[PDB]
Amino acid sequence: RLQVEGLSGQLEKNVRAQLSTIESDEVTPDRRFRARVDDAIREGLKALGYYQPTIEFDLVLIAKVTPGVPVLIGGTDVVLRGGARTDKDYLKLLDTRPAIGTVLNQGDYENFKKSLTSIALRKGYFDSEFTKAQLGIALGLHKAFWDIDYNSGERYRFGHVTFEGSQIRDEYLQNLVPFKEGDEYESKDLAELNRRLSATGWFNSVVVAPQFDKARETKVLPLTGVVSPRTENTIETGVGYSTDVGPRVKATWKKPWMNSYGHSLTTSTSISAPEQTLDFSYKMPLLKNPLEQYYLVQGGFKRTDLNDTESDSTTLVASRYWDLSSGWQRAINLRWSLDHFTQGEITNTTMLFYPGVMISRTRSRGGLMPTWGDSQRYSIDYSNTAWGSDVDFSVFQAQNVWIRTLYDRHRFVTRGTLGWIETGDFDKVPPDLRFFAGGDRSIRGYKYKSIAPKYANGDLKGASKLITGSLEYQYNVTGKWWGAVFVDSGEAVSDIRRSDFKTGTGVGVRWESPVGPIKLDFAVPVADKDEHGLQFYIGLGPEL
Ligand SMILES: CCCCCCCCCCCCCC(=O)OC[C@H](COP(=O)([O-])OCC[N+](C)(C)C)OC(=O)CCCCCCCCCCCCC
Ligand SMILES: CCCCCCCCCCCCCC(=O)OC[C@H](COP(=O)([O-])OCC[N+](C)(C)C)OC(=O)CCCCCCCCCCCCC
Ligand SMILES: [Cl-]
Ligand SMILES: [Cl-]
Ligand SMILES: [Cl-]
């Protein structure tokens, strides 16, 4: 074992980090090893300014180190040529230089050099060169002097972008170029072009390559965006199980490009004992803004046989979307639907036609089980008999998911859902538009959609208002395995002045499996004389 002495602050920290690279307690020499320790100490001290120390050993081994005289900064001379002499980023860097008199750190010199080189790369100074770069160390004066003469040249500007291998018409790609021809080069614009192209889903691969062979004389940099068409068909499946609903299967078939206009088609189905759906979604990007703006035409079929609800539904939807890179989506919707249903003893055929608006956003960082993220969705729908709809109503909805991680190991998932349907003919409203609570992602511990007001005969009727929330805490026990504890609470009522909150609580497991996060929850109803017994759930739940 070895020990130091004679170092006060950071000096005793850097030396300790330098010594913990060679093995201490070991069968080793006593005049060849203490020569290895000596070289290390002097190197850690040299980096912090002390060039002329003194070290000496006794016996466990101890080493009396003395810092000695430090070399100070005598001059940080730097001259800049080209656009750098007047460039704000280069000017800003010149202040980072260490003041005269301060103790020398060799890291500051080489890092200043890295920064000169880094800014040139970022801002397109592709003719940048050091004409001089030297650090003079004068031990006689105990002074160090920079001497850098750096010539950046002039900024390169963007040329034309030529695309290769695209199955999509070129005009769509040109309208995704975030810069104008002639704009001053900026590295993040290339990154943004790559991002935008990839985000369309049109391509298997995207590589934007600058053509330096040409831009040497003109200082105008043409780009070549070579792409490969996306796989024409993709099929994802998914399976889940819950004690109340039973097994559940989802499958989606994506055709991320249907033609050279960049249209895409998604066919989806969700199958369980009580509910079955089949949906189609056809997307048509607008030429002016192919990524941010598009039309959606959706058509769907649904069948429900659940509790006191029997229903079959058909719907068509036309939507106009405005998406932002910030994550916000904004849409105007126009929905038509036909619903044949029986709720309790009430049977009806209802045709609806109504517009609506939707605002949403989803953010995520950390992968499939994100460490941080959130999702928000707010919508308003308005049906009116004046334009052919069978029922007058207004539906307001809001939902939130918030995910945050503390100290790498403590993950908090918070959810909240609000729903309000205002109408004077509730009996004609299809069950799908009414509110029921209970079940996973509603109130765990209660049966799927079992919570709602009832007809006089005891049959479920559905609610005109919905309020639910959940607090969940997860702890990363080991590796990819987490323990979870949660409480869910909410109500589905038709008179908000008359509360009837139901609360469920439970514990669970989470596993970051190769195919994504797998959850397992056990849950019971809390303080309910009418409801007892454990519900459990297993699946690939998304959280957000
Ligand atoms: C709820 C959904 C409602 C359906 C909405 C559909 C709306 C469709 C309107 C637009 C049609 C496409 C316009 C178009 O561009 O047409 C031509 C296009 C080919 O053009 P191209 O220049 O690539 O030539 C080929 C490439 N080459 C020249 C290099 C060889 O052909 C195609 O897109 C043919 C494929 C289009 C099929 C769409 C199927 C929709 C129905 C799904 C089922 C829903 C049931 C409820
Ligand atoms: C590659 C795509 C894979 C899709 C998924 C594969 C099939 C998964 C079946 C899972 C069934 C287990 C759950 C179950 O028990 O569910 C029962 C359900 C209806 O049973 P039920 O009416 O006798 O009584 C229903 C009412 N009660 C039970 C209260 C009396 O079963 C059904 O709906 C069966 C629906 C079968 C659909 C056949 C495939 C069409 C896919 C087209 C679109 C694909 C786009 C990607
Ligand atoms: Cl268009
Ligand atoms: Cl809608
Ligand atoms: Cl009814």
Experimental method reported for this structure: X-ray
Pocket test for ligand 1, best of 168, 202, 257, 258 (most atoms within 8 A of CB): 258
Contact assessment for residue 474 and residue 413, using Cβ atoms and an 8 Å cutoff:
yes
Per-residue CA distances from 427 to 40, 434, 453, 459 (Å): 84, 10, 13, 13
Phi, psi of 380 (to 5 degrees): -135, 130
Ligand nearest to the CA of 391: 5
Which is it for strands 2-5 and 61-64: parallel, antiparallel or unpaired? parallel
Contact 285, 262 (CB under 8 A): yes
Which residues are CB-neighbours of 461 under 8 A, at least 6 positions away?
Answer: 343, 344, 434, 452, 453, 454, 455, 494
401 burial via Cβ count (<10 Å: 0-12, 13-18, 19+):
buried
Output the DSSP codes for 129-159.
EEEEEEEEEETTTTEEEEEEEEEEEPPPEEE
Which domains, ranges and CATH numbers included, belong to the chain?
Answer: 1-70 (no CATH), 71-155 (3.10.20.310), 156-230 (3.10.20.310), 231-544 (2.40.160.50)
Which residues make beta-bridge pairs with 535?
523
Q: Rounded CA gap, 459 and 465, in Å?
A: 18
Cβ–Cβ < 8 Å for 12, 72: no
How far does the centroid of ligand 2 lie from the alpha carbon of residue 160, in Å? Answer: 52
Residues 6+ apart with CB under 8 A from 162: 222, 223, 224, 225
- Ligand 3 center from residue 284 Cα (angstroms): 8
Cα of 312 from ligand 4 centre, angstroms: 17
Angle (CA) 397-403-409 rounded to 5° is 160
Nearest CA to ligand 1 atom 42: 280
Q: Are the C-beta atoms of 16 and 6 separated by less than 8 Å?
A: no
Atom 39 of ligand 2, nearest CA residue: 269
Bridge partners of 411?
A: 405, 474
Residue 29: enclosing H or E segment and its boundaries? Answer: none
Beta carbons within 8 Å of 242's beta carbon, 6+ residues apart: 248, 439, 440, 448, 535, 536, 537, 538, 539
Based on the number of CB atoms within 10 Å of its own CB, is 452 exposed (0-12), middle (13-18) or buried (19 or more)? buried
The closest ligand to the CA of 271 turns out to be 2
CA 250/CA 321 separation, integer angstroms? 26
Residue 86, phi then psi, degrees to nearest 5: -125, 5
Residue recorded with tokens 């959940």: 470
| Mutational test site, ligand 1, from 259, 265, 283, 287, max ligand atoms within 8 Å of CB | 259
Ion ligand 3 neighbours (CB, 5 A) are 286-287
Q: Which of 271, 302, 449 to mutate to test the pocket of ligand 2 (most atoms within 8 A of CB)?
A: 271
- CA 206–ligand 3 middle distance (angstroms): 23
- Resolution for this PDB entry, in angstroms: 2.2
Å from CA of 248 to ligand 2 middle: 9
Q: Is 256 exposed, middle or buried (0-12, 13-18, 19+ CB in 10 A)?
A: buried
